[PDB]
Ligand binder design. Structure first.
Ligand code: FE
Length: 168
């Protein structure tokens, strides 16, 4: 199923996710719906909280043939180093982009879709994508890093878009 993705300024985007107790068929259903939603909207990363599910689940696929599915359940950052930034986007903040400071290289531990643990060292776009997604789970958005003026302007832009989006 394709789930509805929440937009700012929804308060549900600020909720802190609870860890997944046990990776069972219900959780795997959520993971599959999340991938389906992400591809449908053509994103490359999705956090559970963006679809108003407040558990520590993230799906990522940066691939062209939509066939390098990455699932992070209960992710934990073990190490990070360096500093980078690209102009990030987000399906919850339609059509807005901004450069945000991130660590360059990241090492995480997580469970996969089967509930098996794994470690992953990432750099480049993957490292940035994992940080951006891990932020969602503690109620952080990429605009939180920007100046008050920049944040206000982004909110308006999105409110204007959702206002036209429904043409009645
Ligand atoms: Fe996002």
């Amino acid at each position: 199923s394709v789930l509805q993705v929440l937009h700012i300024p929804d308060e549900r985007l600020r909720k802190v996710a609870k860890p997944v107790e046990e990776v069972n068929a219900e959780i795997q259903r959520i993971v599959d719906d999340m991938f389906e939603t992400m591809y449908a909207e053509e994103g490359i990363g999705l956090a559970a909280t963006q679809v108003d599910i407040h558990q520590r689940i993230i799906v990522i696929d940066v691939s062209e043939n939509r066939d390098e599915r990455l699932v992070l359940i209960n992710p934990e950052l073990l190490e990070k180093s360096g500093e980078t930034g690209i102009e990030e986007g987000c399906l919850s903040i339609p059509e807005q982009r901004a450069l945000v400071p991130r660590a360059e290289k990241v090492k995480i531990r997580a469970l996969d879709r089967d509930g098996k643990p794994f470690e992953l060292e990432a750099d480049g776009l993957l490292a940035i994508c994992i940080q951006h997604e891990m932020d969602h789970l503690v109620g952080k958005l990429f605009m939180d890093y920007l100046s008050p003026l920049k944040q206000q302007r982004i909110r308006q832009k999105v409110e204007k878009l959702d206002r036209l989006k429904a043409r009645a």
